[PDB]
Each structure stands twice: as C-alpha cells, then as structure tokens.
Paper text:
The cap intermediate is methylated by the RNA guanine N-7 methyltransferase, utilising the methyl donor, AdoMet, to create the mature cap, m7GpppN, and byproduct, AdoHcy (S-adenosyl homocysteine). In mammals, RNA guanylyltransferase and 5′-triphosphatase (RNGTT/CE) caps the nascent transcript and RNA guanine-7 methyltransferase (RNMT) methylates the cap. Human RNMT is a 476 amino acid nuclear protein consisting of a catalytic domain (residues 121–476), with homology to other eukaryotic cap methyltransferases and an N-terminal regulatory domain (residues 1–120), that mediates recruitment to transcription initiation sites. RNMT also has an activating subunit, RAM (RNMT-activating miniprotein).
Whilst high quality diffraction data (2.3 Å) was obtained, the lack of density in the lobe region indicated that the lobe was absent in the protein crystals. Moreover, only low quality crystals of the RNMT 165–476 monomer could be obtained using sparse matrix screens without proteolysis. Thus, binding of RAM permits stabilisation of a lobe structure, RNMT 416–456. RAM binding, however, stabilises the RNMT lobe (residues 416–456), a domain missing from structures of RNMT monomers. Despite the absence of the lobe in this mutant and in thermolysin-cleaved RNMT, the crystal structures are not altered significantly compared to RNMT–RAM (RMSD 0.5 Å). RAM binds distal to the RNMT active site and does not alter its crystal structure substantially when compared to the RNMT monomer or the E. cuniculi methyltransferase Ecm1 (15).
Author numbering: 167 to 363, 367 to 416, 451 to 476
Write the structure that this text describes.
C-alpha cells in the first residue's frame, strides 16, 4: 500500500541487475549456473533465479526464520504444477560477517558464477573484520570471470543530506535516517538508524569497498546510483514494460519515493583470472 510501489521498484531494479549478469555469465559459455544469494531474506529473489534458469542456488541469512521461510517458499515454488525446471537449493543460517560459509556448505569445494548481495553489505561494516569476512564469503568461492553484484546505500548521498539537515536526522513521509552524529565518519562502525515505514545500518564508503574487494582478486565492473541505473535501463523496452506489468524524473515514483530510493547505488565486481 504505502511502500508497495517502492518495493515493486526495488524488485524491478534487482530483476534487471540479476538479468544483466546472468546473460554475461552465459555469454562466457557457462552452461550450468551456480549462485550464492547472500542475505537472502525470505526469498524475494527466488522467482528471479528461477526464471534465470540457474541450476543451483545457496540461500543464506543471519535470520533463521527468514531462511526457513525462504526454504518453504522454495518448496512451494516447485511443488506448483507442471512447473518447468527449477534449481536445486541449499539453505544456511549463518552470520556471513562472523562465520565462514565454506565451513557450512554441504559441498566445501563448491564454486559460484554469481554472488548476489541485495540490501545486505552495509550491515557488515560494523568493523573491519566483519566487512572483510562478508567480502570473503561473497568472493572467495567465485570462479574466475564470475561476479559479485549488489545494492547498498550510497554514502555520498547519505552524507550530503545529513550535512544539509538542521539535525542529525532527515527524511519524509516514507523514510527517516538518523545518525549517531555528523562530522564523524569512521571507515568502520559509522552507525545510523534507518526507518522504512527499523534496523541499524553502517556507512559503506564505496572507494573503501572497492579497495578491500581487491584482496579477493576482484575488479570493479561498475557502480551506479539507483537513479543513473534507472535512467539507463529504460532505454530498453523489455525492461520498461516489465516494470509496467510489475506495475528526479516525473517518472514512475512519487517525489518522496524517489528520495527514498535514490539513497541507494548498485554495484558489480568481477573475479579476475
Ligand atoms: N551479518 C549478516 N549476515 C547475513 N545476513 C545478514 C546479516 N545482517 C543482516 N542480514 C540479512 O540481510 C537481509 C537484508 S533485507 C534483504 C533481503 C533480500 N536479499 C531481498 O532482496 O529481498 C535481512 O534478511 C537480514 O537478516
């Protein structure tokens, strides 16, 4: 109702992102696709992976109830009738910032063509170790040429609104951000409250994320604001009538919705050879 169109939009953003890199993986002649969905939540991306026609998915999250719900929705998905091919799936409760996923994989030798981290990475920036660990978990088992893709708040946009504010808070009808306070932005542990009409988040300084990713032999493919990404993707009609069947620019979202969503960026990294 209130944020339905915002959610819809986020789903559309993820769809097109996931879509783009599934094709890139396939154009490198990769037949059977293996994917790690890191911080999978309740399975909002299950259907995107099913229509990407991947062969194996690992869903993991720190919240077990979410993992279990993700599993049940998966069970329902291919207990549908005359349901075309579905990936095999593996479900793991774990803190991907404090625990090594390879130690919990049923198959410890397993590799991935894509790690998808959607609206997750920023939780790991509580400390250097947690950040490095989530990056490791996202990137260590990636095959060369494989991709690390995701969505996280854009720190530049967050700071800009903070410093433009009369307080340590800012927002509108839809969202509210509250810093522990402005002027002080440590690389790790920069805490702010994020309210979508409620969970603590950490600032992700992207040039820092870029450097730390190098440790795992990753090179940046691109980084784009939600706005830029939105503007580019709709010059292709497959995506736009996709968006309309799923149901600042004048543009598809109210000005307040645009303020909420324009907070985010999309990124992709590639595993080097
Ligand atoms: N340290 C951590 N390790 C793994 N998952 C975490 C985490 N901290 C938070 N999360 C999870 O990240 C999720 C963010 S909401 C994103 C859900 C899903 N990827 C989607 O796009 O719909 C939540 O499910 C939360 O439980």
């Amino acid at each position: 109702s209130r944020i339905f169109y915002l959610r819809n939009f986020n789903n559309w953003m993820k769809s097109v992102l996931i879509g783009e890199f599934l094709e890139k993986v396939r154009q490198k002649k990769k037949r059977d696709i293996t994917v790690l969905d890191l911080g999978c939540g309740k399975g909002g991306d299950l259907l995107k992976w099913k229509k990407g026609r991947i062969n194996k998915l690992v869903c993991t999250d720190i919240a077990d109830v979410s993992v279990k719900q993700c599993q049940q929705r998966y069970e329902d998905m291919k207990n549908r009738r005359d349901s075309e091919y579905i990936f095999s799936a593996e479900f793991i409760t774990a803190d991907s910032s404090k625990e090594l996923l390879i130690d919990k994989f049923r198959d410890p030798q397993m590799c991935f063509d894509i790690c998808s981290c959607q609206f997750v990475c920023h939780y790991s920036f509580e400390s250097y170790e947690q950040a490095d660990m989530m990056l490791r978990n996202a990137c260590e088992r990636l095959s060369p040429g494989g991709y690390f893709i995701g969505t996280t708040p854009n720190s530049f946009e967050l700071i800009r609104r903070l410093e433009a504010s009369e307080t340590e808070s800012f927002g509108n009808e839809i969202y509210t951000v509250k810093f522990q306070k402005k002027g002080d932005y440590p690389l790790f542990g920069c805490k702010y409250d994020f309210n979508l009409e409620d969970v603590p988040e950490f600032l992700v300084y992207f040039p820092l994320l870029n450097e730390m990713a190098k440790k795992y032999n990753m090179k940046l493919v691109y980084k784009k604001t939600f706005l830029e990404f939105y503007e580019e993707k709709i010059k292709n009609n497959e995506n736009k009538m996709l968006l309309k069947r799923m149901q600042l620019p004048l543009g598809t979202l109210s000005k307040s919705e645009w303020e909420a969503t324009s907070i985010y960026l999309v990124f992709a990294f590639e595993k080097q050879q």
